[PDB]
Amino acid sequence: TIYHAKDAVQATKPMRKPRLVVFVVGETARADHVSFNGYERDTFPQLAKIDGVTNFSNVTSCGTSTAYSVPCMFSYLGADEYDVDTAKYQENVLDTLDRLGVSILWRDNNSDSKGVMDKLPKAQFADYKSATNNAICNTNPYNECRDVGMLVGLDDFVAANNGKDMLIMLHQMGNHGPAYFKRYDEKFAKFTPVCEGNELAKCEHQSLINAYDNALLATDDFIAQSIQWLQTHSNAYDVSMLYVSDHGESLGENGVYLHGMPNAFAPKEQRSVPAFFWTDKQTGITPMATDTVLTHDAITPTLLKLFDVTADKVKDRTAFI
Amino acid sequence: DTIYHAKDAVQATKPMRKPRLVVFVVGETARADHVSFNGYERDTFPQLAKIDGVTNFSNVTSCGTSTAYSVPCMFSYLGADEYDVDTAKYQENVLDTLDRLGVSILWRDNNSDSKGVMDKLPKAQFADYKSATNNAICNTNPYNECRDVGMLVGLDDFVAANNGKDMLIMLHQMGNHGPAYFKRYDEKFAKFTPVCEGNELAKCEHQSLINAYDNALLATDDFIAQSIQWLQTHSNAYDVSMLYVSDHGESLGENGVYLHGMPNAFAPKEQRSVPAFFWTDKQTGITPMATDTVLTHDAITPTLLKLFDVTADKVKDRTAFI
Ligand SMILES: [Zn+2]
Ligand SMILES: [Zn+2]
Ligand SMILES: [Zn+2]
Ligand SMILES: [Zn+2]
Ligand SMILES: [Zn+2]
Ligand SMILES: [Zn+2]
Ligand SMILES: [Zn+2]
Ligand SMILES: [Zn+2]
Ligand SMILES: [Zn+2]
Ligand SMILES: [Zn+2]
């Protein structure tokens, strides 16, 4: 195991108020389909009614796929030295925070870690793609488990870690294709018609867009209920929520669909991602400016600052806060 | 002791093949949004507009907002996110690499100093051009300020002295340095008037300050063009290319902010949005990146290496200008 932060120190310890953070790892969401970034439809109407939400209009993802971007999102090495083949053997930020006492839990309704959780106890990773753990899989014809199912019973995690610092990753299914029409329950079918087939190139363009934007409305609801769930502990915990998407998505420009293109050739749409940060006013955390130029490189500094941790390798590195 | 980052660096072909001669103009205080090619409403680069083969890069971000921070970073191997200005002078930089692989390195400075970038090479490869001892062009203006075009005089003696070798020539411009923009150019570029002729810029009328700044750009446009014109006189025997990047931008009164030097955490967009131009001769086989490519000062080191067919297993995937 190769270290990058054994100098890491937690300045104050939970004493002081414990801190509770949800990190929503998003999936396949494009920045230019976010209402706040100038999009022509209102894809985030619930987040708009929550005070304290910062939308970041200029964030660029590490890469264009889940396997590539996710480990880089928790890396110390930054996009320009990230190497997907050796990422799993590096100390990542969750290894650091777990070593300083923060309780880490990772619930996944997408796929896996991807390696990011592999040095921590297996009990701290939970698969939520199956109805064995996810209580919300019967809400749609496809028996697809839903991201909001990752919220059920999180109060049992808090009680089991009463008074400790806590960081909760919720890894979204989000907007992953090609079958966007299956990513959301029927209550979010606001834009119609939608394309209902797995060959995007036969979709009519607007039907494809409509399905994709309905999926964002489902993600907007999931994020909104994530913050509402944290508000039930604003009494005993300093609560914050952070959202960043792993990568964007192509929707037919120059004939390009889905994602996964090499960075040297990937179009703008595959790397321009939304990010949200919310925190309760009790907590004293100040978000950076909304138009700050940011990348996935800001996640690791952000996560460390959220828990008052210092490591002489990532400070002065721009964060979301 | 010097800390190395590219002792693996390898030159694929040697000068065999045609030798290569490159001028790298390190600019000063130039803003991307005052360049005509980037949509500015005045023609601040009328001579560069008449040269075939010039690529303008419309989305380049400087490492920092000052000479001390940006210049060493422009030649670093570490990238902005691991660059540490306090220790940059003990790092192998890209000029150390190219020098040990045989490329002849020259640094002429009409700005200040290196800043540390040249400190491991023989002092004969750095030349001060701020004074009339080396610069022949200083009596052209009330202030006896020596001019950037004086750095072009006698470069054929350097080429002759390194005949057939690969060569990279840094010319460190005085350029658009403030606050006295009106002093940076001779009267032949005093095209936009009235101009402000005082130090504390806030009393200036906005247009008169802008006018002095834009005349200063016309002087730079002339310096780059004649740099290209000088390289064209050796396109026969050498593959010639010119690269220009400014060290940082400049604030011109927006929200009351002038000059540069703000910490990156608070710096306005204008202090970091810089022009970059790359020119190359017909014969040379070098292809520019797309002009809207998102770039930073981190692209300079790979560019210089690729210009000399050098590969270094540390910047191998890093975006360049070419
Ligand atoms: Zn995917
Ligand atoms: Zn993904
Ligand atoms: Zn490194
Ligand atoms: Zn780096
Ligand atoms: Zn590899
Ligand atoms: Zn400067
Ligand atoms: Zn100065
Ligand atoms: Zn310092
Ligand atoms: Zn030599
Ligand atoms: Zn200066």
Residue numbers in the entry:
A (entry chain B): 23 to 36, 38 to 344
B (entry chain A): 22 to 36, 38 to 344
Q: What does the primary publication say about this deposited structure?
A:
Recently, a new plasmid-encoded colistin resistance mechanism, mediated by the MCR-1 protein (a phosphoethanolamine (pEtN) transferase that modifies the pEtN moiety of lipid A), has been discovered. MCR-1 is a potential pEtN transferase that exhibits ~40% sequence identity with LptA, which contains three domains (intracellular, transmembrane and extracellular), with the extracellular domain being the active transferase. MCR-1 has been proven to be a phosphoethanolamine (pEtN) transferase which can transfer pEtN from the primary lipid phosphatidylethanolamine (PE) to lipid A4. We report for the first time the crystal structure of the catalytic moiety of the newly identified phosphoethanolamine (pEtN) transferase, MCR-1, which can confer bacterial resistance to colistin via modifying lipid A. Like its homologues in the YhjW/YjdB/YijP superfamily, such as LptA of N. meningitis and EptC of the Gram-negative pathogen C. jejuni, MCR-1 was found to exhibit an α/β/α-sandwiched structure and coordinate divalent zinc ions in the active site via phosphorylation of the conserved residue threonine.
